[PDB]
Every structure is written in structure tokens, then in C-alpha cells.
Amino acid sequence: PTLQRVTVFTGSALGSSSLYTQAAQTLAKTAVDRGIDLVYGGGKVGLMGIVADAFLESGGEAFGVITESLMKGELGHEKLTELEIVPDMHIRKRRMAELGDGFIAMPGGAGTLEELFEVWTWQQLGQKPVALYDVDGFWQPLLEMLEQMTQRGFIKRDFFECLIVESDPHALLKAMQTWTPPAPKWL
Amino acid sequence: TSLFDAPTLQRVTVFTGSALGSSSLYTQAAQTLAKTAVDRGIDLVYGGGKVGLMGIVADAFLESGGEAFGVITESLMKGELGHEKLTELEIVPDMHIRKRRMAELGDGFIAMPGGAGTLEELFEVWTWQQLGIHQKPVALYDVDGFWQPLLEMLEQMTQRGFIKRDFFECLIVESDPHALLKAMQTWTP
Numbered sequence A: 001p002t003l004q005r006v007t008v009f010t011g012s013a014l015g016s017s018s019l020y021t022q023a024a025q026t027l028a029k030t031a032v033d034r035g036i037d038l039v040y041g042g043g044k045v046g047l048m049g050i051v052a053d054a055f056l057e058s059g060g061e062a063f064g065v066i067t068e069s070l071m072k073g074e075l076g077h078e079k080l081t082e083l084e085i086v087p088d089m090h091i092r093k094r095r096m097a098e099l100g101d102g103f104i105a106m107p108g109g110a111g112t113l114e115e116l117f118e119v120w121t122w123q124q125l126g127q128k129p130v131a132l133y134d135v136d137g138f139w140q141p142l143l144e145m146l147e148q149m150t151q152r153g154f155i156k157r158d159f160f161e162c163l164i165v166e167s168d169p170h171a172l173l174k175a176m177q178t179w180t181p182p183a184p185k186w187l
Numbered sequence B: 001t002s003l004f005d006a007p008t009l010q011r012v013t014v015f016t017g018s019a020l021g022s023s024s025l026y027t028q029a030a031q032t033l034a035k036t037a038v039d040r041g042i043d044l045v046y047g048g049g050k051v052g053l054m055g056i057v058a059d060a061f062l063e064s065g066g067e068a069f070g071v072i073t074e075s076l077m078k079g080e081l082g083h084e085k086l087t088e089l090e091i092v093p094d095m096h097i098r099k100r101r102m103a104e105l106g107d108g109f110i111a112m113p114g115g116a117g118t119l120e121e122l123f124e125v126w127t128w129q130q131l132g133i134h135q136k137p138v139a140l141y142d143v144d145g146f147w148q149p150l151l152e153m154l155e156q157m158t159q160r161g162f163i164k165r166d167f168f169e170c171l172i173v174e175s176d177p178h179a180l181l182k183a184m185q186t187w188t189p
Helices: A019-033 A046-057 A068-072 A089-099 A110-124 A140-151 A157-161 A169-177 B025-039 B052-063 B074-078 B095-105 B116-129 B148-159 B177-185
Strands: A005-009 A037-040 A062-067 A082-086 A103-105 A130-133 A164-166 B011-015 B043-046 B068-073 B088-092 B109-111 B138-141 B172-174
Touching: A005 A089, A005 A110, A019 A037, A019 A046, A019 A169, A037 A046, A037 A089, A046 A062, A062 A068, A062 A089, A068 A082, A082 A089, A089 A110, A089 B095, A103 A110, A110 A130, A110 B116, A130 A169, A140 A157, A140 B148, A164 A169, B011 B095, B011 B116, B025 B043, B025 B052, B025 B177, B043 B052, B043 B095, B052 B068, B068 B074, B068 B095, B074 B088, B088 B095, B095 B116, B109 B116, B116 B138, B138 B177, B172 B177
Parallel strands: A005 A037, A005 A103, A037 A062, A062 A082, A103 A130, A130 A164, B011 B043, B011 B109, B043 B068, B068 B088, B109 B138, B138 B172
Antiparallel strands: none
């Protein structure tokens, strides 16, 4: 059905170039023009803050999910549509997954990769689209790692028949909406 | 031993695939790694499986005279997936607790070839390392240059300003098991 929310993973740093910020803002505008809200981890620094603000300033809604510990460290964004506090990181990540209709990974560090690998681990274990927003070819070295992992027999070929990889935000989001994966019995 | 003694490398927590991979090299590399570790008095903490390189590495520590500790969840256990001849198999309520326990039990971390689960565990300990919740050596067992493309990825992430060059560079990467364990034994923060 209609994508209503996307769950977004992205760095708590801005990056070396203002191009990451701009790719985030554009992605948010595009999503908000398509009727799509933001679910994310409730931060205010780096690309996390940039994308949440972008959704809000574009006139959309932004839903944050954060742990009680992160909140007490003052890490929580204070003008979201809603900030859910949950007791621990297991709950946080599962809640982020339940709220979204799909996942988008933008540029980030260790944390973003962890989140992304976590959803891929859950999908091995039995189902929503995952898109890599390939801003400036950011995700290309990862796709090479993943292809190498498939050739070496550690991931099934079927991985590539489900994955979305796009550098253009209009096309990234349209592809999540028209997501034609293989039927569960093949996975 | 004294509560003020500094830690040593008595256990390694190993992350690895529930597949064997498309060549026997991975299996043999796991066995050579297990033997080296046991010969140095080092034991296995791992996720408790009996298939793929998980099964191989567990079996090889056992069959060389070492102990192997597994940490698994009720879910995966009801799945018939637990190994049945470990020194101990700990069943915990959820996957969160599983990963916390694997970290707590090990004095260091090795990531061998594997899939998404293995990668996730590796990025999990890193995400923890750079908030200081532990400072334990993390080693990539580079069987046939397996980890080389991820290192490229990480190098690029460091150039684009998303990871600190400081953090990246205390990472052990070795194809040779001797060199890998040696580096983890002599490592400090």
C-alpha cells in the first residue's frame, strides 16, 4: 500500500562537504511533497538534525524514538511532532521499524551501518523496502562488499532482487512505493 | 586473581557466518584460528550455532582441548539451532541480552567471514567502543582478503567526515591467525 512513513538512518556528523546536508533537505522536501512523514532516532546534531528540521520546515511531520539514557544526556530534539521515550535500545530499534513503512539509509558512520545491518539481519530471519540514498556514490564501496559477500556464498543472490539503491530522491522514493520484491516462499 | 590486576586475553568472542561459504578455505582458516587460540590458553565465546563457520569454529576449539561458550536466545533455540556439545550454552530472553552477554564474557572480539549478522555484530561493538562502554581489541580475520572491501568503505567514510581517523586506526586486521592473536594479546588502549 501507500508509503506513509519512512524510517531514516543517518550520521550524527554533517560530513566534510555541505553536499550531504543539501541531499538530505532535498530528500525531505520530496518526501513531504509525496505525503510521507519521517521516523528517525530523535537527535538534533549532524544529518539527523538536518533531515528532521527539513521535514518540519517543509511542513511535514517528524517522529523521534529515543532511549531514556540518551534523553538524560540532552540528546533529544525539542520541536518534533512527537518524541517517544522508550526504556532501551532493543525497544527503540524495534519501534523505529514498526513505525516506518520502509527504511532509508543516508550517509553516516558506524551507527548508521549498524542500524542498516540490523534490518538486513532481521530480514534474513523473516519485510519492508530498504533504500540506500547513494549521495555522491557514498554507498558504492558497501555494494562491492555485499557483492563480494554474495560471490563468497555468505549472502544469497536474492538480496539484490529486493534492494533499492538510488542517488536521486524522486526516484529513490518512487522505487520504495513501486517495490516489486520476490514472494516470501522464494526468500 | 586480584581485583586490581589488569585484564588479559582469556576469551575471545567470535562473530562468524551461519553459512560455510563457497570454498573450504574459510573452514580451514577457522580451524587454524581455533587451534592457535587453544594453544595459547584462549577459549571461545560465540553465538551458539551448529551450522556454517559457527559450527566449525565451536567444534575446532572443542576438538583441540578448549572450552566453547555459546550465548543463544529462546527464539533461535526453539528453532532447533543450538549446538549440543558446548562447555556451556547460555539461553537468554532476547537478542539484546544475547549481544550484551557475548560482549561481557569475551576479552576481545574477532570477526571472521560471514553475512549480515556478522557485520551487524561488528558494527555494534564499534558503536559501543566510541562511547567507551568497553575498550577491548577488535580484530578482522582477513581470510582471502575478505574484509578488504569494508576497509575501503571505512576509509571513505573517514575521508567524507563521518568517522574519526583516530578511531579507525587501532583496528587489528590480519590474514594470519598467529599474527591476529598476537596483536590482540599485546594490544592496549
